[PDB]
Amino acid sequence: MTTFRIENVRIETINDFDMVKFDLVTDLGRVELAEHVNYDSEGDFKSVEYTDSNIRYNMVDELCSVFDLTDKPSLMPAIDYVTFAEIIEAVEEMLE
Structure with a gap:
């Protein structure tokens, strides 16, 4: 499995609400991703x-x-193959 790391983590407010933008960095390149953020009360x-x-x-x-x-x-979806859960868990670690 392709290993990854999370870089350039910044929280901006996009479309009137808050998203974390970050770079997903693997040995095969880097991409900017964006995900919504939840907060406590x-x-x-x-x-x-x-x-x-x-x-x-x-x-x-x-x-x-x-x-x-x-x-x-072939019969396994791409979203399930890649370590998407591990990726989200690493972004959360960068944000605490």
């Missing part, structure tokens, strides 16, 4: 959305463009 960061996630629904070709998709079973 106090306005402090709580989580990065993984469900109504902008990446899973609008930036999969971007996400996959740095992963080596050969060796993926």
Whole structure:
């Protein structure tokens, strides 16, 4: 599996609400991604959305463009092959 790291993490407010923009850096290149951010009742960061996630629904070709998709079973979806959960979990680590 293509390993990754998260770089250039900044939180901007886009389209009247808050998204984290970051670079997904693998040995095969880097792409800018953007995902919505959740906060606790106090306005402090709580989580990065993984469900109504902008990446899973609008930036999969971007996400996959740095992963080596050969060796993926054809019948397994690209979004499930790449370590998308691990990616979201790493962005959350950068934001605490």
